[PDB]
């Protein structure tokens, strides 16, 4: 069994990550093992709803503002709950790195014993007092992401930047446990995650995209196509670096003015790098996400992510709906 | 704090279920935690898929083939792997119950880390020797019905004729401790959990049906619908007995020989129980599930189970299709 | 490995023990797990004293007193706290069962995190309503004995009368696993456990025996002897069990009434009948414990056990000063 | 409940420990947990012995040896079943700490199921080799145990009291359940190997003769007594609810200055004890102010009731001046 604290080490002495960055992720790895116990108790451990949220919130916030005493190296944290970053205490040394923290994704299924997940992304501080403006950097610029995915079995899943590698919470030790070294995302799929419920939504190229995935054999596409939608982000995406798909929240017309439905900080460009780091693809429909240049910390983003063929016909929908 | 074993006495001394079937729903029990265990340790533990199912096939035949000899008072046994049903050895004692168990439903999750879930149903055996024949009875002779749901904690559900109640597993104690009692199912709903990439093979009440859930406010219906799809029955009626909501699966043309997707006897009867004696309704889309009188064990039907007035709804749009 | 249920089983097809003794079993060894949690927790979760010894009689008598619900076939149940034997309920089935029950030895280590332990002893109820009367057979009349030693792990240690066994709690499984069948103590030893503070109240034999010890290779014996003595009965016994030793409580002057400190018919009986299960002796420094035909519930007898020479030994030593 | 983790963050903002120590102290706790992890299950995980012993270092050393890259801040580290002190790989950054490490107390209780123990002791690197850790005990900056029984307890000290932590086992972390541990002045409790009897010197004798005397004796009480075999468990007892621990020198091994090793045993539970309001004497001297000569020296112990630790050094001193 390689634990992930020697797979750590491995990866400083390889010379692809430094003591901090190191260091960083074990503080990470605790709190994602924190918040496993507690949503692994249900209704018995008292955070089982918008106070099971707020509870997680509480968890994160109290490891992840004493991080920098553990090893953290944070310069910033940026919460997906709160509206602005926050700075680390003086109290403690600061860092180098800009954490983003989402500590419950797939909030509607925290209810209903569903798989949900904890994302996280880091960035580099700018070469002091960091503020919102230093966290606006493309999702290229990440140095790590991740999540942790709670389900029958609590896995991290995490990249810095060499591939996309899947961890097991053995419970016994309370340690992960690498178990899929380099996931790889297959170039094709016949498999989908998008919810229908808004198909009147959508704009016409991905109703026109969708549309065909329903002809299957007897459409364009010369295949027969089959869709879950588990409303974890986390958990579809958890599907596709196991054994490829497609995951699409794209743009719709409900709220005209927001870009999509998907935080591009702590959700869109987290998700994005793990999946280009198992070969697989993350586009906005028009536009490789990775590259966007933030404009603002909560900005939204169309996101399409997967087997890397689907999203590039996806994409060709959207792009030959433009130039018609 | 009121744990499973004090519940199922006082169901005993209020005179609704007797030792036998008490003993019987604690083998069970016991058996479903097995299951958690070893679901739970992921690719550490064993589970990890074919070879996923074959295993929880051994851990619950192992366990089921000694009920007797603890209590099961089992005189037959039907697997949903198994074509056939199996008799009890005659080193134990035999006793009235028939068991019908499907060990792994949603298999489809089981290397994904998504919830999965065991169903079960307890039928009296007619008063020697029982074979596949003394198992075709309508659902509304269950006796017992349940399910455990494998998730980021382990949920058992079940009823034996006086309302669903939910036990969470306190994996401390290694015992199921009561956590919702008396499930109800609100009767009306706006989240619907279908398989939309089937839609071109649905009967036309089905597409107008589900049609209309699409045009939301500016259709018939004057309401936004929301959609799930887990591809873990136990799952999605697991969030319905939670928060309500439908879940549909119809007949299609696909294998247009075949009445349905899941099976009368280990999916349809049991769970069709646990909602009904949640207040929710449990059909075809043409006539009450419980009433049907199997032909034979493995026999398929179209399957609308979840907040009853929705039901309603879907049963309405079928019969008005007959009537044209 | 070989499951403890199992073990069971198989002690019934050898036509050793029937199902009732066996589900008894099952009942002691639940209870025990539940012993073994509480004081697992330490102050964290309630044991942590008169007070610590109240709640184990609490969580043990609460199982016991429900346990012909699940197979216990009592008949009446004697607690070392109570001065009387306990009758089952009769609103569930009475079987031909006495129980005596040992919920906490070592009492004075509860708070000081020594091992400590649980001791039974089965006894057939003769051929209704028992009484007190009732519990008093010879030791050589019990159908089964055994104790629970909770240290660093938790081991359950039980004889049906073919050999004495040992089993490991699997804390993941919630189970007893086989860790040393057949134990055997070894004939002779260097180790003795007596608590040599009440060296000035010993009758003479019982003296002279020590001095020898502490001469040594100096004295009549010629070896060296070494000691421990941890005021845990189970946990003294439990190394004989495992390497050899003799353990000596025998009667002293402080309380001239009283024969001795350990009870015939808790702890005396069951420990010696583990011992000569593992080829060791029991022996009250004049005669064979398991031949007592015991006057009361709570008589107290002396006790010399483990290596069937060393304790020869100290039974020389009392019948030659009988004798002079 | 309060966390070990809160409670070391706290003892830094009281300006007790520094950001170094409280790291090493989280390494130690870390490492006492996985000990734990594998003691708990018995013959089910492997280490259940010399062969368990061995297993034991190897789970220790293993993770020491890794210690600088998550906080450790030490700057060599010394194992009792090793002969000299390792020093800390260059890979890692080196810190101002000396630790020393028993991973094994208890050793011939590891397979009977009684509760066995780690120890470990903390020193400040001089501004490393062998020579390095001769230091009196008094110049300890943190010592403590873990006592691995039917719950798992990591009993801790930093120069301002002891104070017992249990581990919870669904959380995976030491939470306070004894703050200042205070040892009763004076017992009617002595932990001593009564089969080493005839080995003593005279005053050690005479004073265990006195015991078991009692109320017929000089001493006007009675005495009880308990042997455990594990040294860690039997102070255990003495933190919690007072006694006497005897480990003396004895005539079986006369070179020797006594069984327990005074830079691995004796000065960490002597701090411990002190710290609780016990007493830690050789039976003449003072252990902490002891100079060690040799990493490995071995020294007689008298730990715990000070009192009674005053009445055994009594014997002893009235026997050097008759």
Known sequence: ??????????????????????????????????????????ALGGVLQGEAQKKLDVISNEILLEANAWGGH???????????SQPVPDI???????????????????????????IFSVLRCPTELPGDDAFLQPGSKQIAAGYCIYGPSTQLVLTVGHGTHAFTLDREKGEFVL???????????????????????????????????????????GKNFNMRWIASMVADVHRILTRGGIFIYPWDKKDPS???????????????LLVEQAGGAAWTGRERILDIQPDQLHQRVPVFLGSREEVAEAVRYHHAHDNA
Chains 1, 2, 3 share one sequence.
């Open 74 to 84: 944070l310069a910033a944290c940026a919460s997906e709950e709160m509206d602005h």
């Open 92 to 118: 403690y040394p600061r860092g180098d790195f800009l954490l983003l923290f989402d500590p419950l994704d797939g909030s509607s299924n925290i209810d209903v014993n569903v798989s949900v997940g904890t």
């Open 258 to 272: 927001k870009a999509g439905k998907l935080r591009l900080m702590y959700e869109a460009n987290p998700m994005g």
């Open 1 to 42: 069994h390689h634990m992930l604290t020697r797979f750590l080490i491995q990866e400083q002495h390889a010379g692809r990550i430094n003591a901090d960055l190191r260091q960083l992720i074990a503080v990470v790895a605790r709190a994602c093992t924190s918040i496993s116990i507690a949503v692994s108790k249900g």
């Open 179 to 221: 178990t899929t070294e380099n996931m790889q995302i297959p170039a094709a799929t016949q498999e989908f995650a998008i919810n229908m419920s808004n198909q009147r939504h959508w704009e016409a190229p991905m109703q026109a995209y969708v549309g065909d995935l329903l002809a299957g054999k007897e459409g364009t596409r």
